[PDB]
Amino acid sequence: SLRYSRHDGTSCVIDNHHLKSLGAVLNDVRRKKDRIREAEYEPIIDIADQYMVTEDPFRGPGKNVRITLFKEIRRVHPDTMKLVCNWSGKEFLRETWTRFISEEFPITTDQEIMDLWFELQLRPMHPNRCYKFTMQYALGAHPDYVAHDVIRQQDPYYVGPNNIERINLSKKGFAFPLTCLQSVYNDNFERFFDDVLWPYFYRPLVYVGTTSAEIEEIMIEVSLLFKIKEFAPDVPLFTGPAY
Amino acid sequence: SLRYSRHDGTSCVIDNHHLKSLGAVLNDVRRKKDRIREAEYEPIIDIADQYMVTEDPFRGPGKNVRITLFKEIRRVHPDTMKLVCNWSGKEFLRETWTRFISEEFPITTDQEIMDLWFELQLRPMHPNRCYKFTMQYALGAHPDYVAHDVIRQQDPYYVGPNNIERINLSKKGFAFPLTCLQSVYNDNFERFFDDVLWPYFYRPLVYVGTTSAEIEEIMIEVSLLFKIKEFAPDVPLFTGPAY
Amino acid sequence: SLRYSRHDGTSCVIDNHHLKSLGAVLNDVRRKKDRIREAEYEPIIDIADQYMVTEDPFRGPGKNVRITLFKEIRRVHPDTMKLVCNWSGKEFLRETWTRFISEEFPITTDQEIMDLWFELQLRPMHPNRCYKFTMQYALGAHPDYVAHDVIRQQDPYYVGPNNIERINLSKKGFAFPLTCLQSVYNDNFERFFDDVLWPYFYRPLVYVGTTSAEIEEIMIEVSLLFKIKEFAPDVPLFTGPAY
Amino acid sequence: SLRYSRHDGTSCVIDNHHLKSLGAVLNDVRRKKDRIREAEYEPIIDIADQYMVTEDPFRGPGKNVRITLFKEIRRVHPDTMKLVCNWSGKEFLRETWTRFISEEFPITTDQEIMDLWFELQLRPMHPNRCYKFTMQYALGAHPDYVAHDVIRQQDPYYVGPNNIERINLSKKGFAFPLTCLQSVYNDNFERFFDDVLWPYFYRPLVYVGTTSAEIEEIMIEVSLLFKIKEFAPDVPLFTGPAY
Amino acid sequence: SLRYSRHDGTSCVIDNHHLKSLGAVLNDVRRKKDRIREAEYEPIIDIADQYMVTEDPFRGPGKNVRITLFKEIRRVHPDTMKLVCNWSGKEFLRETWTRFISEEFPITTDQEIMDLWFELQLRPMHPNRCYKFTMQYALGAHPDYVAHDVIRQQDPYYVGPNNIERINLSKKGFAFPLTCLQSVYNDNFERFFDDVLWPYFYRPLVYVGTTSAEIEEIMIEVSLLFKIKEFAPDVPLFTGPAY
Amino acid sequence: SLRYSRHDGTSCVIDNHHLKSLGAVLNDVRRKKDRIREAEYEPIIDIADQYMVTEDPFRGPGKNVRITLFKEIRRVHPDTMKLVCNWSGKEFLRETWTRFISEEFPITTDQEIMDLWFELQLRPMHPNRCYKFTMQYALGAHPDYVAHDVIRQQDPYYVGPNNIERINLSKKGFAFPLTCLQSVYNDNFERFFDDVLWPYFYRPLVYVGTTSAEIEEIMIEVSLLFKIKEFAPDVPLFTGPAY
Amino acid sequence: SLRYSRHDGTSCVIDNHHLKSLGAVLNDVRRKKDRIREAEYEPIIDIADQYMVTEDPFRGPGKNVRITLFKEIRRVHPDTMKLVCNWSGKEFLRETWTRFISEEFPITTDQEIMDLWFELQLRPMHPNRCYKFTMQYALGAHPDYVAHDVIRQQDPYYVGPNNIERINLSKKGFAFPLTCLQSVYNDNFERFFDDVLWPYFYRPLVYVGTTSAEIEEIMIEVSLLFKIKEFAPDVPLFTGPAY
Amino acid sequence: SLRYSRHDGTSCVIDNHHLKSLGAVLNDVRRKKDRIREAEYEPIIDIADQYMVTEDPFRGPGKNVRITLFKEIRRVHPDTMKLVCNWSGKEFLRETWTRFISEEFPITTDQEIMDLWFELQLRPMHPNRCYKFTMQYALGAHPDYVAHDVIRQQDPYYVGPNNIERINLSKKGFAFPLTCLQSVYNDNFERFFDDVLWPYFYRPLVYVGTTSAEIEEIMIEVSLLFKIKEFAPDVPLFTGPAY
């Protein structure tokens, strides 16, 4: 933050003649030099504007609601990964519906869930170590298929710089307690579960490993991150009766 | 554009001895210096080629057909947004089908609609103002759910530099008058409407606001932008009878 | 002039996710880098804003009226200067009043003469010469003092780059046909002359030389440059009778 | 100073073919590169040519005549200033007229005093000190008003880098022994004094201090600096009788 | 091209004091900085002025007269070259004398042929190819020696950037229709041929190839380029009788 | 050598949308920046293309045949030079003809000797010395003029960086065993010698010295370097009878 | 010139441990950095070593003997050139032989004239002019052909930076008083003239002009510049009898 | 390493004229530019040559003999250090004398031990850790003073980058098996021990720790490093009898 907001200097008049601050005039000269530079490179920006980048979903539009679920410790051998969660489809839907509804109610505004994200957050439990985290996942399997508790690493997802991976769970597969833009109605888990077509097939199965050449002890925080658009009218709240 | 196409200079022969332009030889020396620079940074480009960017859909493959729909003026209070359109699902499909078919017919070539985009284009109606535009949208709701005409802003989409937002309307939800790669058949709105499964559920509901601390008057142009691949054969058009 | 007015690129939305042009995002990054640079040097501009520069009176406020008077050729020896004009006070006031009034009438607006300038404009009369111009002047002397037609140079005024010197003639000494902010009245040279206190004392006596080591032939255009503020009301001109 | 005056190299002809020095050709190439740079920045110079700076009166037109008056030592406490001179108006005019006339006579040429400057020149009298000089002045007061010999500092004039302040004494207030462009006549102090309207009102009263946090011993040289334009004709001096 | 010819800014005089444009003063400062740079590198230019370069004969002194002779197409295998011309000495002299004399007559001025050049000009006949041209030549052989129509490439002349090779044909070997500085006399091919000592020995035999790894189709324009100095007097042409 | 041949990155298509490697897109942006730089300096290259440089005859067209002649040791005093060879014209022609013919025969291809060069190659015979070599030569003199075996240095030729001087021996003066483009005939030294007009006048007389301030011991290799163009047809060699 | 010859610093030994000057160690580090730079650019120098430049004949091998001939003044109209000399072949040979022999005798050493140059040296005769010089020449013509005293300019030779053109006069055409490497014999102009085959055909005819748009007065110094190799033995001169 | 040893390019002579490689001439120009830079900074090197740095004793004069003694593992708590060795003075002298003599014998040359160093070399025993090593030492104490096996860290020596600390053991305190420059005599530990004045007082007591916030397992190699000057004559070794 600068102190003058580019309003540096002033002006005055002596004998019809106009004086202006030297620093301000030098800025005018330097801004003309820069302006010429902008036009010189504008053709180069047009070549770059042939392509686009994507806005961070968590720093971007919509609000973040982090429904934390549980914590867990794992010790992982080198070149392996351990399973983080092994819920069935039903148990996953119970935690999803139950934790979101009981945290957010009363839901007083029309809104829509933009995206549902599975958040895997990792931190070391010893100091003076240097390694990075790795991840692998699946999202569906035979209800009587029980996943390996440990696997060897092969072409995993390298966890990002802040030690957080967020995995999108698309509305096609994973059911949301709020489907579209809607007001809430009277609802319960039983009618929610009954309206899910394949309740036992879809569940997140996530593994975690490291790039370390020794065993490492990992602390894990798992959460569901909801992106939500609210449509709150521009009206007052009154105590009844209104007016 | 340069005048010589890097064919600067020439050569000649005097007494078996070869002469070449000094400027051209200096370019050869500088190109060798640059070529060495390319190889020095090639390992750095490999680190950048681990990731990819996306090509502008409107400057990229396919042609653009802008079916403009209507214009509208709105005055928006600070920290609020006003609804742009409130059509039902049926009225949206009538405008979509009717305006595209009557603008494009006769459709003389096999083709496919790649993408359907809702275009929101905004321009100020007073000069000497400095603010940016914001946007929020929904795409589905109860047919008897009527949207708020004005809402307070919360985590909106910031409109891009040229004051244009284009919102993709995926084939899953919004019905296209041309589904796949096909030739046109005899068609009408009634049979089109009858084959849409959920005609009354999906409609774009878009809001617009500003980053200004005062009321601002906005002019709005709404359009449907179609991306289209044509498959025109490499054959002549003759007056009948051919040959 | 640049083609996009810093509105480079655009934005669009695919599956709730926001895309923006790569060139525009890189400009945002570079503008942040520059903005940090501005704040780093703002303390330096404050040291420069302790002092001020003066605006060019001829490119600055007020309009320019160039009442050209006469032309003249002179041949000047090295290290000398020749007199340009030798009018008495009365003859100078006749040219001043007569030429300005007959050029500007009808004077239809309230106005004030800000400054009166004596303009000496010089151009070579042979090609392929390289030298600069020099100048010296006086403004008053005994009416029976007749000035030397030629003098040796000593510490002269070096004429500026465009070969124009403009010498201010302050209202204290030299009388203006329009003293202050006023509408014109019925006027003539005789009543103007009668109201000048010292009509025979003040007259510009200007010399011109060169930095050349040989005789040079100079063409001279002399003019009076008036700086004028007009106070024209924001009202229409009608043909009488009005309304 | 360079040794070749940009006439570096030479040329010769062998078998109709023209050879030229390599160093000279490289200068031609570099001068073209610079010339392109000049044109690229010419628009920036136009923004700077909206304003003007003022030429040093003492390095610029006119000659300098330094009529030194007296020397003085003062010891000044921190945050104070001591009076340098306390002459009445008459005593100041006696020194001004007497010292200039007796130093310059015989005045053999027509001339005019452009400006009269009061010069205050300061030097330390101990080594290994680090401080700057400050100044304050007045120019008129009741003849029976006697100035304070010492004052506290408040918003003083900071003396320039070379430890010299020169204060203009305008012809309106302070009388010159040579009013305009004139030849000298028989003159004396009594008729000069009689023609000064307010001889006892105008006199320079100048104070001097420092930026030091300890007492400092200052040596002072006071002078009157005259700027003078001479109008010496381009004619010989002969022993009489001429020709 | 710049707009002010380094006459940027101006000057004026207010109360004896000289003002000059800020942009012009900054140029004076920057020119002093550059001038110091010139002197710093002048010793380096002296080391480069130990050697010389040669002026382009075709951009340099003398005028160019391009007597085009014929055009030709060739298909050249990789690593080979095809003969361009196979004239005998007599046939070459007939084309040389005949084409120059009939193109240039009437030759109305005293002049001398500085140099005679064989011009080989090459252009591709397919687009979207990338290769360069090569050349080899001989100038004399037994009159009954008939040259190979195709040869393998070995250490050829690499054609210059603009696809033009010009081969000097020295006056010792190849006869000129105008030997020295002369006016034309009545002349014909028979007396020209009779005065050539070895008319059948000297003829240009030129080959052309490529750097391509495939057959390429080449279009060829062959010409004789004369360099000519004219000595036209500074006199008028009149209709007879003169005066 | 770089690993990708500027084919860095790739592309793919997801949901009609085109993705391209980030590193490749950044190269496109940087190449546009460079391309703009090329056009900015193209006017400067045109000033340099007014002149030309000469191609190294030994790295350039034609093949090199180094007919080494003899070796020699000399001790040279400071500021002096010793004669390298003192052959008469006849003895020089015997070595020239004899050594070239017996080394090159059988000469199976039509060819022409472009240039004949006298090669003087020098190397120190003590380590840990620092000096350069110098050279002087003559090419003709009275047959009974015997050259000084040692001379003082005055304005000599400074030998090049690699300690090799090559002196052209023009066909005018020094006779070649192969005059023009020709096939070989039955030949011998006696008929070769008989056809040389001035066999005893032309012989290379070369001196060698140093820039050292002490005696230095020099090893010398002398050779004749022939530049040769071959005209080998594009035909097979068969064992007879052919076909 | 530097003061230490890169022998900066020293060394000493304290308790077996070696100390060395910090400045010297930093030079060792910087020299390693530079040495790495040399190797990085060595591949670029190899591309430049494909071509060669030519050493200034007058700053290079051989000594210069400037036999000045005459001086001359000319006034030249714009776009014209005036003849400098109009001697016949015989008169040119008389000046050449006579002036060289009488200036150089006694010629006490074996020597050879490397080159003969016609030197045209030009200087302005007015100050404060800015123009360059131009040149054109011929070398042979009919003895009864008398050249135009003035011609219009067309594609002239632009004189070099130092206002000197030197035109080579090859031994083929122009006869030298010393043909080869030789001792002098008894000689005279008559036997010299008798042995010149074409004494009346070859003579330098040189014109001079300017790039000025006005008449200019030129001073001309003409000279013959001889390049000479001496072969002075390393022997003493004694007074006779020797030893 | 570069390929040409700064002998880039060559030279040749054509028609008395000297040609030299362009790349070599450009190096000459750049070397002159650098040489000017050296002289510009030579005054700055003189300011740095007021001070000196010390040569690495182990990369510098003398040879290194590393008498390794033992290896050891320690586990060290954070902010603590463990004792590495606890020998008495006698046991230290036994290892010193015994290990050096039995490793080096036969000692066939006159020599002197310059310095004796205690080498502490440290390496981690787990991967993927990030910490540095610390050290503290004493050299003498009461023979019946037994040192603490572990201490808390306070202002320790930070081990160097390569994880090696070498501690000088001065000849005053610690006895050497070879005192000065000497040949070996018949010697044994008992007479060596008897001639040490204070055999039980001086012994190295060294501690080791880390900068880690967790326990770390360290592997330790301890050695005595001898610096030795040999004085081997320049004479042959023969089998007896010699000659």
Numbering used by the authors:
A (entry chain A), B (entry chain A), C (entry chain A), D (entry chain A), E (entry chain A), F (entry chain A), ...: 6 to 248
Please share excerpts from the published article on this structure.
Using pulses from X-ray free-electron lasers (XFEL) with sufficiently short duration to outrun radiation damage, the structures of biological macromolecules can be obtained from nanocrystals at room temperature. The resulting method is referred to as serial femtosecond crystallography (SFX)2. In the double-flow focusing nozzle (DFFN) that we present here, an inner liquid jet is focused by a coaxial faster outer liquid jet that is itself focused by gas as in the traditional GDVN. Our DFFN system reduces sample consumption up to eight fold compared to a GDVN, can inject crystals in their native crystallization buffers, and is suitable for time-resolved mixing experiments and future high repetition rate X-ray sources such as LCLS-II.
Cydia pomonella granulovirus (CpGV) crystals are the smallest crystals used so far for structure determination by SFX15, with an average size of 400 × 200 × 200 nm3 (and about 10,000 unit cells per crystal). The average hit fractions of 8–10% obtained at these low sample flow rates indicates the continuous operation of a stable jet over the course of the experiment and the absence of interruptions that often accompany experiments that use GVDNs. Even so, either the use of water or ethanol as sheath liquids leads to stable jets at much reduced sample flow-rates as compared to normal GDVN injection.
